[PDB]
């Protein structure tokens, strides 16, 4: 198995640093820490990336990331939970959504749940004896439940603490047959407090975009991402909170279905701006620059064409499509997206 110990080391250091850091009103997860989280989830997936032929889902659900049968033999899972004589597992066992007040608690709880295949209620996403089931009624619903609980749990914290910007996404494989509009309306129609402009703004932005742009756009797809067989399509600009939230990388397989220009932002630069790679033609868009370190790495795409609904153009505005590293200045809607700062940026090609 391909086990990237580097992201386990970085994750451990992040939790040590932030364990007793109180979540205040504007507290957010830094670029470095977001990239560590992102790496951890992707490395977890890569260690045991496919189901076994004798134990697979006839619905095509990716059980290798959803069941104890696979996760307990995933060497990345095992190495992470055993790291430092199991000290993160010891801390993890003290946590639940209702008592979390600190950054490191929040990150450890959300991420260890995901890379253990556990809901916040402690149930596994899917049961082992259900791997081979063709009953879509409970297979699809279990995954909707798991996806919604990742996001709603975080909104429950944000509302209790009155925090604006903490955010970890539900990774792309947990959207198996999940309707984004229903997720959004289910959660927001049921809790008026989540609508407060000072509560859960990146969670809101992530779910809102997914409520208006479905996973598979068929003939309207302009872009397609694939990581370990999990695909996703887009026809708008793709903000960093989407790529970070879903666990996609600008180094994954990216296919263009139109001749529209895209600006693929990949790293911060040394003049307070960002460096991007431009692609134009149909076909595979391959970033061949070195992968930036966690301090500097960005994942974001601005799509340029003449047919985007005016109400959706703001997703590509510079200071919305990339998450501000100064927490209080993060943008999350058309009412505060701005498009200044381009002087500081550079086309790499």
């Amino acid at each position, epitope marked *: 198995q391909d086990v990237n110990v580097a992201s386990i080391t970085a994750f451990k250091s992040m939790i040590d640093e932030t364990w007793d850091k109180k979540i205040e009103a504007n507290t957010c997860i830094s670029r470095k820490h977001r990239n560590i989280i992102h790496e951890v989830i992707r490395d977890f997936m890569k260690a045991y990336p496919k189901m076994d032929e004798n134990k697979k889902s006839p619905l095509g659900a990716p059980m290798q990331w959803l069941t*104890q049968y696979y996760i307990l033999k995933n060497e990345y899972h095992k190495t992470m939970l055993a790291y430092d004589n199991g000290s993160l597992n010891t801390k993890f066992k003290t946590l639940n959504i209702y008592m979390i007040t600190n950054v490191g608690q929040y990150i450890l709880y959300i991420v260890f749940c995901i890379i253990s295949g556990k*809901n916040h*209620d*402690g*149930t*596994p996403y899917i*049961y*082992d*004896s*259900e791997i081979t089931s*063709n*009953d879509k*009624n*409970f297979i699809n*619903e279990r995954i909707k*439940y798991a996806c*919604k*609980q990742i*996001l*709603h*749990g975080q909104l*429950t914290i944000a509302l209790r603490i009155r925090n604006k910007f903490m955010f970890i996404g539900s990774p792309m494989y947990l959207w198996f047959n999940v309707n984004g509009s229903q997720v959004y309306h*289910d*959660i927001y129609d*049921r809790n008026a407090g989540f609508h407060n402009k000072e509560i859960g703004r990146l969670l809101y932005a992530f779910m809102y975009y997914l409520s208006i742009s479905g996973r598979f756009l068929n003939d309207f797809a302009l872009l397609k991402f694939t990581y370990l067989g999990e695909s996703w399509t887009f026809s708008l600009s793709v903000p960093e909170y989407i790529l970070y939230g879903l666990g996609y990388s600008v180094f994954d397989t990216i296919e263009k279905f139109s001749n529209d220009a895209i600006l693929v932002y990949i790293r911060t630069n040394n003049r307070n701006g960002y460096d991007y790679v431009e692609f134009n033609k149909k076909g595979i868009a391959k970033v061949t620059e070195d992968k930036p370190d966690n301090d500097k790495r960005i994942h974001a795409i601005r799509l340029i064409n003449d047919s985007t609904d005016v109400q959706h153009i703001h997703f590509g505005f510079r200071n919305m499509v990339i998450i501000d590293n100064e927490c209080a200045n993060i943008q999350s809607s058309a009412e505060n997206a701005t498009d200044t700062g381009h002087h500081q940026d550079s086309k790499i090609n």
Partner: antibody
Amino acid sequence: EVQLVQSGAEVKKPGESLKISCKGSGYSFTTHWIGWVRQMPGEGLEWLGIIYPGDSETKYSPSFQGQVTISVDKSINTAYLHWSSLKASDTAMYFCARRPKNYYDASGYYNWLDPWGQGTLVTVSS
Amino acid sequence: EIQMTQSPSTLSASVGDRVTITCRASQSLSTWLAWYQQKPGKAPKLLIYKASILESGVPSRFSASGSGTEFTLTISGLQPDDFATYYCQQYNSYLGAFGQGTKVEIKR
């Protein structure tokens, strides 16, 4: 107050069709799922499937898919369980029960509600 | 849904006894477990939901606890109308499979 009233005992032959009913009163009928569960003589309980009366969305256990139909008549607050062709192995007591519209949400799961229906005994013999 | 194992199948007890019925699963059901009582020819009656919460109207001699993989229903002082069959039921499902049942009978 809340009652689920089921139709009377049935005595049928294999191959005959049958429709039994569950009448819900004293609550919002269109916004609670109705589930059907059976208990064969001397056995435990086994679910057949459920229906949401507001829009008639149905979810069948794979054991019963294609062999029964569940339906509703909203005008009389009635849910139905139908066979086009009974088997002798369908001899059992049939219960109905109701469940909240969101039987799960992002915070957890919700149980089937009391009271259940009183039960309809179906006897299938040649 | 997942297989549950309910035990014992028959519990022989007396009025006034503290009796315990157990339900186990190989993976966690969290709190999503109910307990039912059933008497001959009658519909099951809900006693407990969310693994430990008494259904409204159920007498306080009934209680229950859960760890996720092990669940216990305790009747703290059996009374003359508690002889019946009891079922656990998982309900983190659109259906929710029942345990095999426990008959509580009069000991002599």
